[PDB]
Amino acid sequence: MVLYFIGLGLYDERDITVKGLEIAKKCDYVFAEFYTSLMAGTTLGRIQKLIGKEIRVLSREDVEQNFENIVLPLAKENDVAFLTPGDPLVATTHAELRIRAKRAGVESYVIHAPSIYSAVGITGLHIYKFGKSATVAYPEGNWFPTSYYDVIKENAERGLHTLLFLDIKAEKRMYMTANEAMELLLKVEDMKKGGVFTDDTLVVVLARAGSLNPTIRAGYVKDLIREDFGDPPHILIVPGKLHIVEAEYLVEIAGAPREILRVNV
Amino acid sequence: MVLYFIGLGLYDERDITVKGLEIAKKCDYVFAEFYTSLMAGTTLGRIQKLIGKEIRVLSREDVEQNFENIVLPLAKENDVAFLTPGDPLVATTHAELRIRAKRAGVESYVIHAPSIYSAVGITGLHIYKFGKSATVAYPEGNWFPTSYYDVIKENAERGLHTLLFLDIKAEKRMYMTANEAMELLLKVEDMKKGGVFTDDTLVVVLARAGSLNPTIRAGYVKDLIREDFGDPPHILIVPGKLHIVEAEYLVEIAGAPREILRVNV
Ligand SMILES: Nc1ncnc2c1ncn2[C@@H]1O[C@H](CSCC[C@H](N)C(=O)O)[C@@H](O)[C@H]1O
Numbered sequence A, B: 001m002v003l004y005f006i007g008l009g010l011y012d013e014r015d016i017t018v019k020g021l022e023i024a025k026k027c028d029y030v031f032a033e034f035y036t037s038l039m040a041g042t043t044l045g046r047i048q049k050l051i052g053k054e055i056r057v058l059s060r061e062d063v064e065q066n067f068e069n070i071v072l073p074l075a076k077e078n079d080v081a082f083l084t085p086g087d088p089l090v091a092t093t094h095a096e097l098r099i100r101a102k103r104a105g106v107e108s109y110v111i112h113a114p115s116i117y118s119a120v121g122i123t124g125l126h127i128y129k130f131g132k133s134a135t136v137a138y139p140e141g142n143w144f145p146t147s148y149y150d151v152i153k154e155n156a157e158r159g160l161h162t163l164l165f166l167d168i169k170a171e172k173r174m175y176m177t178a179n180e181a182m183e184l185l186l187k188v189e190d191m192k193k194g195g196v197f198t199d200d201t202l203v204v205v206l207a208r209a210g211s212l213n214p215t216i217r218a219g220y221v222k223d224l225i226r227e228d229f230g231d232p233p234h235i236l237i238v239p240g241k242l243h244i245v246e247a248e249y250l251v252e253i254a255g256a257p258r259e260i261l262r263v264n265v
């Protein structure tokens, strides 16, 4: 009669919360999805080993179209767990699943876990200064989406930071790198000439957040566009005007050039 | 030899990640602060029991003025952890403490935990639509803070949601309620008259996020301003223009007036 939405956290199998683990262990059935994002620092096997349960992976179609047929039925007479990377409900489509549960007469509860949305605080940038978020999508065919560029412009215009999620082909396990994202943005700039993203733009790269050894780098596009930030996942941030304390953290912790202390503050 | 910043999560001791727990259990010394936020579902004792170490609580002054005199000295010869509610680097000035660690020759690592900043996803409002965040501070003496009002205005004109952290006086054991936050906003509205926050404004209240049964309520200020949302901590949200699916969730899950379903495109 109960369905638990449980977050797996940022990077590996230990990023789930103690509450999440214990509840998942007591569940009769455990499902999971790995299409909204991936858990780069672990494997399905390692997660299964930790939970001590068989985990049935569901595709986007399984969830978006058949959640009420695959998961909810068992949730009616048993304790069921639905695992997702990060924090449950951050992915725009997950919240709606609770409405499906309600209509099927199933109670649902949410067990949170660290999300990249909050983990970016490790960049030294003030969380309250982050504006609207956006996703950089790979162009393809005659389709060249560029809305994420406008999001940066509107945020930066108001002195706000822009968190950019990078595209991911979950099934194919292909990760968009910060480098590729910078190239795309430069390409978009060259097309809109809005003076939003150029070689002189200051950016921050956060790679493998959640890991004990994440890569935190800050610098101008011209110097970072071809830098190796390590293995994915990568997240790109275009900060707005910086508070001196943010700048000093980027210099001292993220190896940013001293120049930011006078050019971006 | 090392200093760890470890988040404890939203509500109780079990909101700490497995990673944070395993690492804390092995540290030689464990310090913590409980003034940046309120964990309403546990106690120092329960945390100490779970971690299996005595936890020395530090005050805001101990941290802000003597972190390098109380904590860092031990980190040079031992494994030390600094515990905080939620995520250690979200809506706090703890990031700067890493700079102090560096300058003191102490390597530091960060272990994330669930943060209110992303837990708001449980309100059903899309995370990416949240703009700049702000804090509703208690008026004191002749000083009456009003900046949070402008943040709402700026976000709303852009169709963005506004997350409002509510003030806290840990030592005086005072936790601002959503009701008090609303009262203050109505006053600032009278003062500035920007049509930003009135009795007809739709708002969302999230209380005790992290618990299995947090209070999630949506409605017009005139109707919620006197409603009892239970014990603290509380968070207040002023939505911007809603997507139909967001309104859907607010109605079905947070009991919002069914009229908000009729979104004005
Ligand atoms: N479980 C919870 N429910 C509602 N609000 C919460 C909350 N935990 C924190 N807050 C809000 O955040 C304020 C502290 S701000 C510090 C937040 C912390 N670093 C985090 O990551 O959550 C509180 O006064 C309250 O308004």
Ligand SMILES: [Cl-]
Pocket (backbone or CB within 6 Å): none
């Ligand atoms: Cl500011």
